[PDB]
């Protein structure tokens, strides 16, 4: 899909890296009151990923991330593995005591 | 289930299309107040020429 | 003689002015109409299988909030845009009030549902770059992977 | 805190009791639209720059005069950011030299 | 139509231009996504040179609505209100439905 | 006279319109067919060997996952695209249903 | 058994290629509702001209 | 190497207190074995398709 749409890996990473952060634009006075200006832009929907702009022609026709990638929820590179009674893998936790207490 | 918004643009009717060429060679006598961008109407004078 | 505008339209080209000479290939006027004004939507190729048997769309334009209307007749073009791999859907809209002017943006809205197909949550589809399959749970509750064939996801 | 506040002024000896509200702040949210922006070929960040610097007085740099320091900032005249409506028509020059609000 | 236009050019702040007429062109520039508004300006002094910049401020009347100083309008995003002053000086609040503001 | 479209296809060019004159060198219409629609795949130059006569090709288009295409024939073009550094492998696909659109 | 995948472009049939040129000169009388992008079957009138 | 073949983390989403890792990568198939890497599809800056 990359080649087909004419998009390099780098073009993707860069665009991705600029479609997931909030920004504040000072405040403003109305009825003698402070009005903070919050600018949304946080990723939190799969569609948001699927709607990460990559390329846009003059036409106004854009090319989203959904055109070169499926956005699936998966597991990270596991570092620790926990098993219980040899009948299932589970998540756990260990309480660390401050040495000498 | 689907629900997607497709982008679109407004353009000229390409079935309502007309290019006005002179039937035969000649020189322009005068040209009316009319430039690219103006809205004309069927019958509007374009230019007077001698052939 | 006098050359007149054959039809109601807008001069998109006027290549000769006064004091000049004219020839057969010279163009005095390029006049394009806009009453039955045209609109064209860029629909991602991905859902061609769906839009072919489509019902209606709901056209809207930014410049005009009131001119939002449903579209029940259109025409899908045989060629998709290479540059953006999108289908071309063209629709004609009544425009006497000269509201929609060529150059404005627009949004063709589509809400529909496909024919009844087998459905499983996307989280269940284990897919490599060729090997897609899912893990099934038999009677006794044992695990068993089976190679399946995907059609297309949605929501 | 609102109940406990108003019952405090009914007590014999209290002069003035007030409870600080925890969510009594005002906001002017700029809910960016990935689709509408991608249209003009703009990333979230691209849009937000106007929020922080154009509308807000975002400090861009600092001049140096000896030991002392000086703040520099960018911003449209206060007029383009008077009220919310003014922001709705906040003049933006897209990367593709398209003039929009 | 009823709009009121007033022109000013930075190059010649000493001149006051009169506008012969104006016409809102039918075709919006497809490159800028803007409507075209053409003005014709009296220029016998030749102080208005082509290529120069020009600021075009307009004023448009709107359908009569109840009007109040913008400062007197409170807003919580879910309700808008003002503070009326009774006959006896009593300050009393009331909800209102906003239409639009400007200037 | 009346010029008719000599073959079933798609108009890719149309230089002549109402009012004009017409000449020998003008193009009233360019029409391209698509029943035996073409599909040209790009093959990196270093994997040239990978494609031999006995090879078995199977085509799929994302736009229409409901269709199963049959390949009339295929030919490994002699000239490798100098811009992509890929060999050209042209397939001809049965397309009477017109579900396979160019682009 | 080797196995690899490649991307491809669905392009027009170039052996089914027809470019209409007027056998002789003249002027256009009429032009049927047809613009670049449409699909025309054989026998579809493009225009009328006087030669 | 890092992002296409490896699961290089590119960024982190934010949902309240919690954090989420985001990553780029070709389907496991293009990186199954060494040979698969030898034919790892690369789209050069100059839009040339190579391995």
Swiss-Prot record, chain C:
The gene is cusB. It comes from the Bacteria. This is Cation efflux system protein CusB. The cus efflux system is composed of CusA, CusB, CusC and CusF. Part of a cation efflux system that mediates resistance to copper and silver. The cus system plays an important role in copper tolerance under anaerobic growth and, under extreme copper stress, in aerobic growth. Induction: Transcriptionally regulated by CusR in response to copper and silver ions. It comes from Escherichia coli (strain K12). Belongs to the membrane fusion protein (MFP) (TC 8.A.1) family.
From Swiss-Prot, chain H:
Induction: Transcriptionally regulated by CusR in response to copper and silver ions. It comes from the Bacteria. It is found in: Cell inner membrane. Changing residue 9 to I: Slight decrease in copper resistance. Belongs to the resistance-nodulation-cell division (RND) (TC 2.A.6) family. The cus system plays an important role in copper tolerance under anaerobic growth and, under extreme copper stress, in aerobic growth. The cus efflux system is composed of CusA, CusB, CusC and CusF. Part of a cation efflux system that mediates resistance to copper and silver. This is Cation efflux system protein CusA. It comes from Escherichia coli (strain K12).
